[PDB]
């Protein structure tokens, strides 16, 4: 016969999501500069709005298609329309998001708007997504606030790569003082301690690490140049469609907001555009300018591997 629902077994208590109410205008979304007071009763509704694909236009996808359902990321790299075309952005890792404003990637430099870059509130991130990404109806104030409540409630997972004893390993501790070496100078933009729970390993500032993607004629030119050296001599196709990550790009800004190093093991494809395919690539001076991110040039393979192992421990 024809498939149908005969009955529904209710195991737990009944739960219904927030209603439609009145959608916000884009100016109303921009009208929220700073966060609203946290409400832990709205977090589940926010989780629903996060995982729901039905609110979208035809039901293509949801927030969970990018940021996963773990509230982490899929590592998918996209081209958004507010920052310019040809400018790629690695999908943000959203665990422990409230601890390090401003938001997104691009920092205060080149962004007086504090919306696209140097985002003042999480509201200006998700709230815009209906019209600038999903291309669907805007969120009501309540549902938006609930969503932001869900985002702010996300906490770090912690690194699996350290001993059950809770301590570090000899390789991780070997890499720790390479990390904290004053000449290497990772502590400068990434201050923090491994066993300190409140350590964010970020200065929450805007720096130039030489990861800005420019054109062949320089900044604000076209077309882009290959920033991946290893991939360049590898003979990889710049416009190739089968690459996990773009080896080219055109950025509107040279500087970016520094991300946390916490749960960096769980971010696939690091930096802003997803230039670095492995942790090692954030070090070896392949996808960035020489010694513009730390000074690693004097280091050799063993030290670098130890440093990677220490990064995995964060």
């Amino acid at each position: 016969g024809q498939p149908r629902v005969i009955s529904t077994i209710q195991t737990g208590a009944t739960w219904e999501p927030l209603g439609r109410e009145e959608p916000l205008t884009v100016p109303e979304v921009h009208f929220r500069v700073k966060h609203s007071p946290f409400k832990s009763e709205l977090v589940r509704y926010g989780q629903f709005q996060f995982n729901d694909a039905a609110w979208s236009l035809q039901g293509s996808y949801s927030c969970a298609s990018c940021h996963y359902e773990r509230g982490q990321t899929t590592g998918l790299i996209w081209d958004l329309g507010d920052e310019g075309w040809g400018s790629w952005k690695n999908t943000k890792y959203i665990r422990g998001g409230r601890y390090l404003p401003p938001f997104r990637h691009e920092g205060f430099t080149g962004h007086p708007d504090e919306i696209v870059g140097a985002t003042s509130s999480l509201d200006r991130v998700c709230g815009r997504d209906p019209g600038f990404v999903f291309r669907s109806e805007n969120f009501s104030p309540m549902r938006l606030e609930a969503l932001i409540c869900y985002i702010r409630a996300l906490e770090f997972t912690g690194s699996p790569f350290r001993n059950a004893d809770g301590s570090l390993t000899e390789a991780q501790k070997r890499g720790q003082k390479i990390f904290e070496d004053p000449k290497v100078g990772c502590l400068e933009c990434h201050p923090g301690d491994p066993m300190d729970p409140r350590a964010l390993f970020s200065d929450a500032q805007t720096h130039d690490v030489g990861t800005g993607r420019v054109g062949v004629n320089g900044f604000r030119s076209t077309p882009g140049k290959v920033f991946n050296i290893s991939a360049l001599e590898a003979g990889e196709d710049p416009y190739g469609v089968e690459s996990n990550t773009p080896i080219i790009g055109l950025d509107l800004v040279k500087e970016f907001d520094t991300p946390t190093l916490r749960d960096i093991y769980a971010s696939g494809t690091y930096f802003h555009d997803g230039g670095a395919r492995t942790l090692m690539d954030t070090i070896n001076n392949t996808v960035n300018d020489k010694d513009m991110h730390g000074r690693t040039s004097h280091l050799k393979q063993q030290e670098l591997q130890d440093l990677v192992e220490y990064l995995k421990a964060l």
Partner: protein
């Protein structure tokens, strides 16, 4: 209980998973936010108990005899062994990061646990007699989401959901040998939530999404950003990999998750989490399409938005967030676990 990834408390169970005893008398529901497993009598459809397990179970598997339940505790990084008759957890074995799934061997002598940690690639094997982890099978890439065992019992597939990767693959393991024979890549795929076998073991089904990453984000129409797909892979050496659409032109199935295979392999059941519904497909029409089409023709047909209506049996209304589905041994009933609605939808199938 805690909402996943948060320190915020909730009283709601939030079922993430569902399965059924081989005798079909009992449903075992994994409660993610309840940190326990709900037992439901299939006949009377009411709750016979709630067994406490370790924290945030995302999965469970039943022994062939049905005397034990192996539950996957994701955040505890462990696996709970539960006595079904006693309604009590008799052990905790600890495994690699984030088991998202576990399956019992046909002989019931072995349990395979997929460790889904982003930087973690492992399948941990567990002897049922020792009730302990034996060894670990390293996959070809990171983050296996789920495994499945052949009716043959000599082969084990693992869907590898790999962060920061457009091409996401499936690993084939020889159980007697215990390592990777072959790795088959699904191109332009993401978010693989499940893998199932056909009763004859000649095919495997995998639910996932196809992003277009290399394109501007402009409209929502014609799946410009995301399309939703089910892929059928022929287990034959050099077999076809067929990516097929789950979507209409103006109607899409958001984030397909769970899958249930008809015992005789007539129908395929797909939990659709985003659109809160169960998509039922005709497997003889699907496999018929696979056998009668070349690789090129199938690759072209992946983007056909009218194709579904050929093999689509039904789309059945469900509760909110049906992340998992399961079938009765007679295949006459399909149960769907709804997270947000905190319940289970019972569906009468086409089988009579």
């Amino acid at each position: 209980g805690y909402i996943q990834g948060t320190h915020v408390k909730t009283d709601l169970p939030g079922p993430f998973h569902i399965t059924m005893s081989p005798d079909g008398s009992t449903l075992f529901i994994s409660n993610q936010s309840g940190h326990s497993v709900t037992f439901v009598d299939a006949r009377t459809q009411k709750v016979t108990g709630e067994v406490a397990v370790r924290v945030q179970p995302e999965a469970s598997a039943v022994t062939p005899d049905g005397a034990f339940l192996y539950v996957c505790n994701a955040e505890s990084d462990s696996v709970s062994v539960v006595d079904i008759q006693r309604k009590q957890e008799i052990k905790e074995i600890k495994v690699g990061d984030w088991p998202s799934g576990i399956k019992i061997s046909p002989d019931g002598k072995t349990a395979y646990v997929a460790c889904s940690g982003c930087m973690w690639n492992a399948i941990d094997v567990i002897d049922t007699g020792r009730m302990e982890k034996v060894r670990s099978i390293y996959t070809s890439d990171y983050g296996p989401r789920m495994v499945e065992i052949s009716p043959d019992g000599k082969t084990l597939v693992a869907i590898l959901d790999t962060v920061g990767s457009i091409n996401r693959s499936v690993d084939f393991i020889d159980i007697a040998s215990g390592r990777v024979v072959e790795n088959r890549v699904i191109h332009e795929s993401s978010n693989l939530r499940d893998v199932v076998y056909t009763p004859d073991g000649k095919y495997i089904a995998v639910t996932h999404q196809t992003p277009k990453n290399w394109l501007p984000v402009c409209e929502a129409e014609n799946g410009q950003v995301f399309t939703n797909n089910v892929t059928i892979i022929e287990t034959k050496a050099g077999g076809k990999v067929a990516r097929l659409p789950l979507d209409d032109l103006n109607n899409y199935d958001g984030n397909p998750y769970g899958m249930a295979m008809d015992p005789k392999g007539k129908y395929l059941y797909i939990g659709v989490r985003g659109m809160h519904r169960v998509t039922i497909l005709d497997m003889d029409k699907v496999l018929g399409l696979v056998r009668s089409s070349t690789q090129e023709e199938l690759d072209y047909l992946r983007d056909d938005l009218g194709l579904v209506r050929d093999y689509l049996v039904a789309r059945v209304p469900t509760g909110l967030g049906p992340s998992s589905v399961c079938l009765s041994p007679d295949g006459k009933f399909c149960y769907a676990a709804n997270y947000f609605s905190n319940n289970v939808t019972v569906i009468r199938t086409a089988v009579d």
